[PDB]
Each structure stands twice: as C-alpha cells, then as structure tokens.
Write an enzyme that holds these catalytic residues in place. Structure first.
Site, PDB file in Angstrom:
ATOM      1  N   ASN A 108       8.563   8.995   4.786  1.00 57.83           N
ATOM      2  CA  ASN A 108       7.362   9.720   4.356  1.00 57.83           C
ATOM      3  C   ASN A 108       6.442  10.137   5.518  1.00 57.83           C
ATOM      4  OD1 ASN A 108       4.425   8.282   4.140  1.00 57.83           O
ATOM      5  ND2 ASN A 108       6.066   6.776   4.321  1.00 57.83           N
ATOM      6  N   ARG A 109       5.800  11.293   5.338  1.00 48.41           N
ATOM      7  CA  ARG A 109       4.733  11.783   6.203  1.00 48.41           C
ATOM      8  C   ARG A 109       3.558  12.305   5.364  1.00 48.41           C
ATOM      9  NH1 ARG A 109       8.924  15.379   7.652  1.00 48.41           N
ATOM     10  NH2 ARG A 109       8.724  17.472   6.756  1.00 48.41           N
ATOM     11  N   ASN A 147      -5.744  -0.744   8.406  1.00 50.20           N
ATOM     12  CA  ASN A 147      -4.510  -0.074   8.701  1.00 50.20           C
ATOM     13  C   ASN A 147      -4.659   0.732   9.983  1.00 50.20           C
ATOM     14  OD1 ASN A 147      -1.988   1.091   8.571  1.00 50.20           O
ATOM     15  ND2 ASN A 147      -2.499   2.500   6.903  1.00 50.20           N
ATOM     16  N   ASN A 149       1.624   8.593  10.795  1.00 50.92           N
ATOM     17  CA  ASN A 149       1.377   9.968  10.325  1.00 50.92           C
ATOM     18  C   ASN A 149      -0.066  10.491  10.462  1.00 50.92           C
ATOM     19  OD1 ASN A 149       4.113  10.063   9.402  1.00 50.92           O
ATOM     20  ND2 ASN A 149       3.507   8.848   7.608  1.00 50.92           N
ATOM     21  N   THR A 150      -0.882   9.798  11.256  1.00 55.45           N
ATOM     22  CA  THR A 150      -2.211  10.268  11.671  1.00 55.45           C
ATOM     23  C   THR A 150      -2.209  10.158  13.193  1.00 55.45           C
ATOM     24  OG1 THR A 150      -3.261   9.588   9.586  1.00 55.45           O
ATOM     25  CG2 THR A 150      -4.737   9.793  11.508  1.00 55.45           C
ATOM     26  N   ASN A 162      -6.732  -1.299   1.066  1.00 54.71           N
ATOM     27  CA  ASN A 162      -6.250  -0.888   2.363  1.00 54.71           C
ATOM     28  C   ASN A 162      -7.066   0.331   2.820  1.00 54.71           C
ATOM     29  OD1 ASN A 162      -4.607   0.580   4.307  1.00 54.71           O
ATOM     30  ND2 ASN A 162      -2.975  -0.861   3.789  1.00 54.71           N
ATOM     31  N   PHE A 217      -2.238  10.216   4.909  1.00 48.23           N
ATOM     32  CA  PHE A 217      -3.430   9.691   4.241  1.00 48.23           C
ATOM     33  C   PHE A 217      -4.030  10.701   3.266  1.00 48.23           C
ATOM     34  CE2 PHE A 217      -4.647   6.570   7.991  1.00 48.23           C
ATOM     35  CZ  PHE A 217      -3.809   5.582   7.499  1.00 48.23           C
ATOM     36  N   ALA A 245       0.841  -1.204   0.000  1.00 50.37           N
ATOM     37  CA  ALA A 245       0.000   0.000   0.000  1.00 50.37           C
ATOM     38  C   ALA A 245       0.876   1.254   0.000  1.00 50.37           C
ATOM     39  CB  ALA A 245      -0.967   0.020   1.177  1.00 50.37           C
ATOM     40  N   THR A 253       9.450   0.518  -1.412  1.00 48.28           N
ATOM     41  CA  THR A 253      10.687   1.349  -1.440  1.00 48.28           C
ATOM     42  C   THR A 253      11.774   0.910  -2.444  1.00 48.28           C
ATOM     43  OG1 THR A 253      10.307   2.053   0.800  1.00 48.28           O
ATOM     44  CG2 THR A 253      12.548   2.397  -0.026  1.00 48.28           C
ATOM     45  N   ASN A 302       4.161  -2.102   8.721  1.00 46.87           N
ATOM     46  CA  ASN A 302       4.184  -0.727   8.253  1.00 46.87           C
ATOM     47  C   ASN A 302       5.610  -0.128   8.416  1.00 46.87           C
ATOM     48  OD1 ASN A 302       3.153   1.893   7.429  1.00 46.87           O
ATOM     49  ND2 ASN A 302       1.113   1.224   8.144  1.00 46.87           N
ATOM     50  N   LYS A 347      -3.024  -4.570   9.519  1.00 43.51           N
ATOM     51  CA  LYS A 347      -1.651  -4.136   9.240  1.00 43.51           C
ATOM     52  C   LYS A 347      -1.084  -3.461  10.479  1.00 43.51           C
ATOM     53  CE  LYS A 347       1.422  -2.032   5.873  1.00 43.51           C
ATOM     54  NZ  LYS A 347       1.534  -1.614   4.447  1.00 43.51           N
ATOM     55  N   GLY A 400      11.578  -3.520   3.597  1.00 45.70           N
ATOM     56  CA  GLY A 400      12.914  -3.677   3.022  1.00 45.70           C
ATOM     57  C   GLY A 400      13.193  -4.892   2.161  1.00 45.70           C
TER      58      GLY A 400
HETATM   59  C1  LIG Z   1       5.524   6.938   0.327  1.00 49.23           C
HETATM   60  C2  LIG Z   1       4.947   5.798   1.124  1.00 49.23           C
HETATM   61  C3  LIG Z   1       3.560   5.764   1.331  1.00 49.23           C
HETATM   62  C4  LIG Z   1       2.955   4.721   2.045  1.00 49.23           C
HETATM   63  N1  LIG Z   1       1.607   4.717   2.224  1.00 49.23           N
HETATM   64  C5  LIG Z   1       0.968   3.721   2.893  1.00 49.23           C
HETATM   65  C6  LIG Z   1      -0.507   3.687   3.097  1.00 49.23           C
HETATM   66  O1  LIG Z   1      -1.237   4.583   2.636  1.00 49.23           O
HETATM   67  N2  LIG Z   1      -1.059   2.673   3.784  1.00 49.23           N
HETATM   68  C7  LIG Z   1      -0.335   1.663   4.296  1.00 49.23           C
HETATM   69  O2  LIG Z   1      -0.910   0.749   4.926  1.00 49.23           O
HETATM   70  N3  LIG Z   1       1.016   1.610   4.151  1.00 49.23           N
HETATM   71  C8  LIG Z   1       1.720   2.577   3.488  1.00 49.23           C
HETATM   72  N4  LIG Z   1       3.132   2.542   3.326  1.00 49.23           N
HETATM   73  C9  LIG Z   1       3.860   1.430   3.930  1.00 49.23           C
HETATM   74  C10 LIG Z   1       4.200   0.349   2.928  1.00 49.23           C
HETATM   75  O3  LIG Z   1       2.979  -0.239   2.472  1.00 49.23           O
HETATM   76  C11 LIG Z   1       5.109  -0.699   3.572  1.00 49.23           C
HETATM   77  O4  LIG Z   1       4.432  -1.242   4.713  1.00 49.23           O
HETATM   78  C12 LIG Z   1       6.473  -0.164   4.066  1.00 49.23           C
HETATM   79  O5  LIG Z   1       6.988   0.917   3.279  1.00 49.23           O
HETATM   80  C13 LIG Z   1       7.556  -1.219   4.118  1.00 49.23           C
HETATM   81  O6  LIG Z   1       7.842  -1.741   2.829  1.00 49.23           O
HETATM   82  P1  LIG Z   1       9.062  -1.231   1.901  1.00 49.23           P
HETATM   83  O7  LIG Z   1      10.290  -1.289   2.784  1.00 49.23           O
HETATM   84  O8  LIG Z   1       9.095  -2.211   0.770  1.00 49.23           O
HETATM   85  O9  LIG Z   1       8.638   0.145   1.458  1.00 49.23           O
HETATM   86  C14 LIG Z   1       3.790   3.598   2.597  1.00 49.23           C
HETATM   87  C15 LIG Z   1       5.178   3.659   2.370  1.00 49.23           C
HETATM   88  C16 LIG Z   1       5.792   4.689   1.665  1.00 49.23           C
HETATM   89  C17 LIG Z   1       7.297   4.628   1.501  1.00 49.23           C
HETATM   90  O1  LIG Z   2      -0.055   8.163   4.174  1.00 48.47           O
HETATM   91  C1  LIG Z   2       0.900   8.011   4.960  1.00 48.47           C
HETATM   92  O2  LIG Z   2       1.483   8.994   5.462  1.00 48.47           O
HETATM   93  C2  LIG Z   2       1.366   6.671   5.418  1.00 48.47           C
HETATM   94  C3  LIG Z   2       0.450   5.710   5.821  1.00 48.47           C
HETATM   95  C4  LIG Z   2       0.923   4.481   6.286  1.00 48.47           C
HETATM   96  O3  LIG Z   2       0.131   3.588   6.639  1.00 48.47           O
HETATM   97  N1  LIG Z   2       2.257   4.276   6.340  1.00 48.47           N
HETATM   98  C5  LIG Z   2       3.128   5.232   5.958  1.00 48.47           C
HETATM   99  O4  LIG Z   2       4.356   5.022   6.009  1.00 48.47           O
HETATM  100  N2  LIG Z   2       2.683   6.408   5.504  1.00 48.47           N
HETATM  101 CL   LIG Z   3       0.588   9.611  17.781  1.00 46.22          CL
END
Ligand SMILES: Cc1cc2nc3c(=O)[nH]c(=O)nc-3n(C[C@H](O)[C@H](O)[C@H](O)COP(=O)(O)O)c2cc1C
Ligand SMILES: O=C(O)c1cc(=O)[nH]c(=O)[nH]1
Ligand SMILES: [Cl-]
Ligand SMILES: CC(=O)Nc1ccc([C@H](O)C2CCCCC2)cc1
Ligand SMILES: [Cl-]
Length: 363
Positions: free
Chosen positions: A113-114, A180, A185-186, A149, A117, A64, A325, A252, A223, A303
């Site tokens: 990231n921040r 989730n 970031n909320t 999600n 949502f 996601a 990532t 996450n 999650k 990762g």
């Molecule tokens: C820019 C960005 C936005 C993300 N947005 C969401 C999100 O909206 N909802 C969610 O459940 N996880 C979100 N994630 C978390 C990823 O789904 C994942 O759990 C996390 O980045 C670890 O995987 P990675 O190391 O392959 O990125 C986000 C990650 C990044 C880097």
């Molecule tokens: O939208 C985001 O800021 C966000 C949501 C989430 O579940 N995880 C994350 O790293 N960023």
């Molecule tokens: Cl908090």
C-alpha cells in the site's frame, strides 16, 4: 467450516469483483454496521494480559490502517479482537495519494500500500469517539482497550506540532496513543526515527500527554519501521529508556522487497505487509526487547495469520500482537483461529498463560 467458506469461496469471489481499496471500504462499512455474525470463541483466562495500565482480554488486536477514521471500532470488538487501534489520524483532513494505491500479491499472501495518510482529520475522529465514549469506558474496564494512532499532515512544517495536536485532541479519548514515525508513504517521516529528531519529538509528545488530566491520560507508544539499521535501533532503545516511553509497536510495513516475491505487482511503490514481512518483524521485536532489557512493552505486528505466528512474536518479546493483512486473505475467521491455536500452543509448550510466554526465547 467458517474458515474454509471465507478462504476458498467468498474471498476469491470478492477479490474477483472488487479492487483492494473498494473491498477495504466495503469491509469497513459491513464491520461498522455489525452485519458480520458475533465471534463464537469465548476467550480463556490464559489469553488475558495486563500491560500499559490496562487489562487485555486477549492479546490479538487489529493493527492501524484498517479503521483509519474510528468508524468500525465496535464491530471490530464483535469480531473478537482484544483491542482496537484506529488511525493513522492527521490533524487536518487530507485525501492521501492518487489511486490506485493498494495492491494484492496473493502468491505471497502480501499487500503493498501507498495510501499516504488518507484521513478525515482529528476533529471528525474526535466527535466520532465522543459519541461512543462511555461505551468505550465500559469496554476498557471489561478488558477491551482502544488505541489511537497519530500521523502527520503532508504539507505540515513542524512535525512535532502535528503530533502534539493529536495528543491534545485524541489523547483524552484513548487508552494508548501511537506516535507513527514509520510510514513509508509520507516524505521524510522515517527521518523522525533518528536519535535527535526522535528525542525532540517525543519530549514534546510526553509533555503534552503529561498535561492531560490523570483519568484522561494515555500510554504513549512509538511505532517503528522493520528497515532500521542496527545504529537506528540502538538509538531508539536509548531514547525510549531515557524519556520513559511506555512502549513500542514493532513493526510497520517494509520498503524492502524480499527475494522470492512472486506477485506481478511486487515492484509497486509502497509498504509491504503480510507473510514476507513476518520474520523480519519478529527479529525486530527480538532485538528491541533485548536492547530495552525486557522493560518496555512491545506490540508485535507483521505477517501474523496463525497461533504459531502470534506465539513466535510473544516469545520474541511481544506482550500483545496485531494483524491486518491476514484479514484481507482469510476473512474474519482468522481472529478466532489465531486465538484458538495460540491457546493450544501455550498449553503444549507448558505456559500457564500468555504472560509466562512473553520474552521466553530470551530466557
Ligand atoms: C492498507 C494498509 C494501511 C495501513 N495503514 C497504516 C496507518 O495508517 N498507520 C500505521 O501506523 N500503520 C498502518 N499500516 C501498517 C499495519 O498497521 C501493520 O503495521 C503492518 O501491515 C504489518 O501487519 P500485517 O502484516 O498484519 O498487515 C497499514 C497497512 C496496510 C496493509
Ligand atoms: O497511510 C499509509 O500509506 C500507511 C501508513 C503507515 O503507517 N503504514 C503503511 O503501510 N501505510
Ligand atoms: Cl523518504
Ligand atoms: C485492503 C483491505 O483492507 N482489504 C480487505 C478485504 C476484505 C476484508 C474482509 O475480510 C471482508 C469481510 C466480509 C465482507 C467483505 C470484506 C477486509 C479487508
Ligand atoms: Cl546495519
């Protein structure tokens, strides 16, 4: 060949031109239009997994956050992902946090990231999934499922009602739903992982889900964060087994900043993803698998950028894995590369397939 061109030439040029949010927006746009060439890798039968009431042609999904709004789902399957998770989607539209809100740490192969949502909302996403709904039913039958999600609006009073709304609107269009409760970031969202808050939340979610017609009834996954105390994890495991939650997405992003980060932007507020999260995530999969006695399917995420990384999570307890990532550093060729290497490693370690490898470290 293709991996080297992206890693060494095309991606450093893209990073040099565009900020990470601009590069993300361009990536979604290019993926949605199908401008990327089709993935040459045919998935072998040994990559097939059967879990969550569905066949998965390969165990490597897009996490996601990449496709928050359901815009690039078909392009993501064309890239060779075995399943696609869209979102997080909030009930109402909302903008997210002010810019800048995404940061590269190239020295760490990490992102912070921040976003907070940013979401087009349930109604926009609903209509978008409806437009390709029968295409998705065929994809799912062919072993290419869709996850959705669900998140919570910033200003909402009743969190459970935001999630309930999400189940009613997008549950019918999903193979699985993700609650989730782990975004860093909320404000106050991670408090929903606590035992009593979680039990009340998920009771309401499963009830809304069980009210859907049988053919339109998705699996519900939770999650979770990588930053949980032992008490939190044991409590989640208990709630999950008590209520019959269908699975866990582990993990996450982390609010920690591991010793050794080199990126100039390491002290930016947000969730950290990529290589520094990897083993923290694998160990969380390990603990959650043991606490659930291997009976609750885990999707492993954090990762993953190689076949080894994927297999460590699988062996730790993950039935499926996700990545995001890695795509920001290595480009689309990472998908084929993870699968090819996974397949080689399974053969080398004497596994007939992915299924045989799941939880193998615990035996
Ligand atoms: C820019 C960005 C936005 C993300 N947005 C969401 C999100 O909206 N909802 C969610 O459940 N996880 C979100 N994630 C978390 C990823 O789904 C994942 O759990 C996390 O980045 C670890 O995987 P990675 O190391 O392959 O990125 C986000 C990650 C990044 C880097
Ligand atoms: O939208 C985001 O800021 C966000 C949501 C989430 O579940 N995880 C994350 O790293 N960023
Ligand atoms: Cl908090
Ligand atoms: C934060 C984020 O999401 N960054 C990101 C950056 C690049 C990419 C793609 O690999 C790249 C493919 C070729 C066309 C340009 C985009 C994906 C995500
Ligand atoms: Cl602890």
């Amino acid at each position: 060949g293709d991996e080297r061109f992206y890693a060494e030439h095309l991606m450093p040029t893209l990073q040099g031109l565009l900020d990470p949010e601009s590069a993300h927006r361009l990536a979604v746009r290019f993926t949605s239009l199908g401008l990327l060439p089709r993935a040459r890798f045919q998935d072998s039968d040994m990559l097939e997994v059967r879990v969550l009431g569905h066949k998965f042609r390969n165990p490597v999904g897009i996490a996601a956050g990449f496709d928050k709004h359901g815009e690039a789902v078909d392009g993501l399957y064309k890239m060779g992902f075995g399943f696609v998770e869209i979102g997080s989607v909030t009930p109402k539209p909302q903008e997210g946090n002010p810019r800048p809100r995404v940061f590269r740490l190239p020295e760490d192969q990490a992102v912070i990231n921040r976003y907070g949502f940013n979401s087009h909302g349930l109604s926009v996403v609903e209509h978008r999934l409806r437009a390709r709904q029968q295409k998705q039913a065929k994809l799912t039958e062919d072993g290419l499922p869709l996850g959705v999600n669900l998140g919570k609006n910033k200003t909402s009073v009743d969190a459970a009602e935001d999630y309930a709304e999400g189940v009613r609107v997008l549950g019918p269009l999903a193979d699985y739903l993700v609650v989730n409760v782990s975004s860093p970031n909320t404000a106050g969202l991670r408090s929903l992982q606590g035992k009593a808050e979680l039990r009340r939340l998920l009771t309401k979610v499963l009830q809304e889900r069980d009210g859907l017609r049988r053919v339109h009834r998705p699996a519900v996954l939770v999650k979770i964060a990588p930053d949980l105390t032992s008490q939190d994890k044991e409590d989640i495991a208990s709630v999950v087994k008590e209520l019959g939650i269908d699975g866990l997405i582990v993990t996450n992003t982390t609010v920690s900043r591991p010793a050794g980060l080199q990126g100039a932007l390491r002290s930016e507020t947000g969730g950290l993803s990529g290589k520094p999260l990897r083993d923290l995530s694998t160990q969380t999969i390990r603990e959650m698998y043991a606490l659930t006695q291997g009976r609750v399917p885990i999707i492993g995420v954090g990762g993953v950028s190689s076949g080894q990384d994927a297999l460590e999570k699988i062996r730790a307890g993950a039935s499926l894995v996700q990545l995001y990532t890695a795509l920001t550093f290595w480009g689309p060729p990472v998908v084929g590369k993870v699968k090819r290497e996974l397949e080689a490693l399974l053969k080398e370690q004497g596994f007939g397939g992915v299924t045989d490898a799941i939880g193998a470290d615990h035996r």
